[PDB]
């Protein structure tokens, strides 16, 4: 009976089903005849002769007169640098017109953006105007600007991911998610800068820009003036873009009601810029006039996730975000301030006072948060951890803790923190990978006493930035 057969098939990958065609001629027909079920093609990596036969399989089987079928996910990547060109050429030349690719992950690093555009245009298999999502791990080039022409060519495109692995030399209401990941070594420019500053992208829910170099010559770019163009921006991730600064970003947050809602923010400058402090200075135009309204609260009120890893933010700046209640504290549920050198704790004796993070004030403000990340924070010595011990009652919602890659924190602080936490029913998760001072017997006692449900102790794991999971800075 035909009704059951998609239900059998769809629990099995396209490749596995295509191999399952060889069980017998009857089942060959059963599988081959249900075109709709092959909703993914994870071909990557593939050689050209194999790709020719895949395309031939489309030309034989999928090429129905009636215009029905579409594909939810096509992933193409060449096994060979030259065959990259041949595969892309054949793809845009021979894809059956009646059948539409919904989402295209065309992972072709040698291809220039110009060649991609030209191949779409002369190929004429116009699904590329009609696909829903596009991802291009490709070579950049600065002169032709054709990476903008892609969007203008593909008005149905909602999610775009440009991954500029290499370099060589208007309203966009459709767009909902933009990812721009750039190899910081190679991409010595900002590819979408003119488009981002001139155009508007009103539907845009998420933006994710990493590795680009903000040009010095245009202060409007450095002052995030373009960033005003995207209201309703539920998530903002911005990382390792060398010439950006949190300092300028917080001016934009000061002087405009730039967003009605951010659910999440993730700002990560790479180098140690000068000490940034929350600029609570509220000037008046004249004493006989009103002050400027400081829009920090209405911008930042909505945040569920605040990530500021490495951003040189001073501890007092973060306390002022809490005391002013610019951060709501109830809406906020996860916080990352790892690698921030300008964070000191009240138990320390050698600092300027404005670098102190009053964890008691802060934890009293934002108490119901679920996840904390203080990874790489050398300043979190064992003495400073005593602040967390005495502040356990103000963090009882915490499930997931990352303090990994800290070369100071002894297992002593881990044990007394967890013993005090256990006075709340263990902690769900703890990350102490790369920490040199977390004694083996201590962590094994932690497991044996079951003080943490899961604790990670890969001493040999040198790095924290799991690509795609923890960071979008490229490789």
């Amino acid at each position: 009976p035909i009704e059951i057969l998609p239900i059998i098939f769809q629990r099995f990958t396209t490749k596995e089903l295509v191999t399952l065609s060889l069980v017998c001629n009857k089942w060959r027909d059963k599988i081959l005849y249900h075109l709709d079920c092959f909703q993914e093609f994870n071909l990557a990596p593939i050689n050209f002769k194999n790709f020719v036969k895949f395309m031939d399989f489309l030309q034989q089987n999928f090429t129905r007169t009636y215009r029905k079928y579409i594909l939810s996910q096509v992933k193409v990547s060449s096994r060979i640098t030259s065959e990259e060109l041949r595969i892309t050429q054949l793809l845009f030349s021979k894809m059956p017109k009646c059948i539409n690719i919904e989402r295209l992950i065309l992972s072709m690093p040698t291809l220039t953006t110009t060649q991609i555009f030209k191949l779409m245009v002369r190929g004429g298999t116009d699904f590329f105007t009609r696909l829903l999502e596009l991802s291009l791990m490709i070579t950049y080039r600065p002169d032709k600007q054709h990476e903008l022409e892609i969007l203008q060519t593909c008005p149905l495109l909602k999610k775009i991911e440009l991954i500029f692995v290499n370099s060589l030399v208007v309203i966009y209401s459709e767009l909902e998610k933009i990812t721009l990941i750039c190899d910081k070594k190679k991409i010595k420019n900002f590819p979408l800068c003119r488009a981002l500053l001139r155009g508007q992208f009103p539907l845009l829910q998420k933006l994710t820009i990493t590795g680009v170099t903000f040009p010095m010559n245009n202060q409007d770019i450095m002052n995030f003036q373009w960033l005003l163009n995207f209201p309703d921006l539920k998530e903002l991730w911005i990382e390792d873009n060398d010439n950006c600064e949190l300092s300028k970003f917080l001016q934009l947050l000061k002087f405009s009601n730039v967003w009605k809602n951010l659910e999440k923010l993730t700002f990560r400058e790479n180098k140690l810029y000068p000490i940034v402090n929350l600029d609570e200075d509220q000037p008046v135009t004249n004493d006989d006039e009103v002050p400027s309204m400081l829009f920090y609260k209405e911008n930042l009120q909505n945040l569920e996730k605040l990530d500021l890893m490495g951003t040189s933010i001073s501890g007092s700046a973060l306390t002022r975000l809490c005391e002013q209640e610019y951060l709501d504290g109830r809406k906020l549920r996860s916080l990352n301030i790892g690698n921030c050198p300008n964070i000191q704790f009240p138990n320390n004796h050698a600092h300027t006072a404005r670098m102190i993070l009053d964890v008691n004030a802060v934890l009293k403000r934002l108490s119901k948060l679920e996840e904390i990340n203080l990874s790489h924070l050398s300043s979190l010595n064992d003495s400073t951890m005593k602040s967390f011990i005495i502040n356990v009652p103000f963090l009882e919602n915490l499930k997931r803790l990352d303090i990994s890659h800290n070369f100071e924190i002894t297992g002593i602080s881990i044990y007394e923190f967890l013993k005090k936490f256990q006075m709340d029913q263990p902690l769900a998760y703890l990350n102490i990978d790369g920490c040199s001072q977390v004694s083996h017997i201590t962590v094994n006692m932690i497991r044996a006493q079951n003080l943490v449900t899961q604790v990670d102790c890969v001493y040999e794991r040198d790095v924290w930035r799991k690509f795609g999971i923890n960071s979008y800075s490229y490789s």
């Binding site: 992950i105 992972s107 690093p109 991802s135 791990m137 991911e161 690509f467 795609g468």
Partner: peptide, 21 residues
């Protein structure tokens, strides 16, 4: 979605370069 793996490039005397200025 994937972190890169390196592969050795190679250069040879292409006709385009032979027809450069």
């Amino acid at each position: 979605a994937i972190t890169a793996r390196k592969r050795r490039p190679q250069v040879k005397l292409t006709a385009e370069k032979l027809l450069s200025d």
